[PDB]
Amino acid sequence: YSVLYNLAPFFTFKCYGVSPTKLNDLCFTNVYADSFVIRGDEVRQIAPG
Amino acid sequence: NTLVKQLSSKFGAISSVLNDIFSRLDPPEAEVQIDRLITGRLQSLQTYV
């Protein structure tokens, strides 16, 4: 996760249940990625509940 | 036996293991989680006494 600041940072980057601040030393069973495109106003809609 | 078994209660925290909490999250939430855990365990100890 260290090599991610090659793309314009300033990116809404919110982690639920974990802190991304230099905490990449956690082993996960299987990691899933879902990517798509939304509008700026509906960014806040992407959150649990 | 009840005192021993009370150690496996989350008490509203993410997990019942202090090391996982410290190695998974950033301090500002870690203090409140471990504070909840410590308060629960202290209450159990006082009841046993």
Rounded Cα–Cα distance for residues B40 and B49 (Å): 14
| Contact criterion met (CB < 8 Å) for A19 and B14 | no
- Specify the resolution in Å: 3.4
Rounded Cα gap, residues A24 and A32, in angstroms: 16
| Residue A15 forms contact with B (CB below 8 Å) | no
Reported for B12-18, long-range contacts at CB under 8 A and 24+ positions apart, including other chains, are B12/B36, B13/B37, B14/A17
Q: Which of B18, B33, B17, B24 is nearest to A17 (CA)?
A: B24
Q: How far apart are CA A20 and CA A2, in angstroms?
A: 10
Where do we find the tokens 């950033």?
A: B26
**Of the candidates A10, A12, B40, which has an alpha carbon nearest to the alpha carbon of residue B48?**
B40
Q: Which experimental approach was used here?
A: cryo-EM
Q: Are the C-beta atoms of B36 and B13 separated by less than 8 Å?
A: yes
How far off is chain B from A20, nearest CA to CA, in Å?
8
